[PDB]
Amino acid sequence: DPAPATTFAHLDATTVLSRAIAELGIYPAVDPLDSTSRIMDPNIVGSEHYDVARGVQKILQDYKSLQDIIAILGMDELSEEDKLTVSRARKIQRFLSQPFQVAEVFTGHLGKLVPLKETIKGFQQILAGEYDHLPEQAFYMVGPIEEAVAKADKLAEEHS
């Protein structure tokens, strides 16, 4: 349509909010796959940024393919290689969630302002497989990667 098509020429990026992501308790409810940007390029944002971002972008696409197979076939009948990429993907999509300072009043949890360097090294370590021993819920609603480890540590003490 002329209206959006004309507008799309001027856009440098997009941010698609989804109910599907919101229904999984993931706020902000930004769709990681559908949201895109022009400046996502090795030459513009560096080589490190592009590689880590594409790693998260790939593993979430692979997760969605493997998530279907679970519904069609079953829980097992999946190569151990896939079950690792599924487990890491569910940690990644939870680490994408973040508590905001704006929401402090009605939510209660403290907001976080994650720097660019902390964000990249956070997801980079998850793809490499450094925090595989940690659970899924440890990465839910936290700022930097340090709080994800500290949150996992507040279980085990006061476990169960």
């Binding site: 829980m75 599924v86 487990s87 569910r90 021993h133 940690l134 659970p135 899924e136 819920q137 996992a152 540590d153 279980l155 085990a156 003490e157 476990h159």
Partner: peptide
Amino acid sequence: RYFRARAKEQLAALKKHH
């Protein structure tokens, strides 16, 4: 469900360790 159980198992591992 499977990974929900895995969360409890790994949490028991770090329970015994840390």
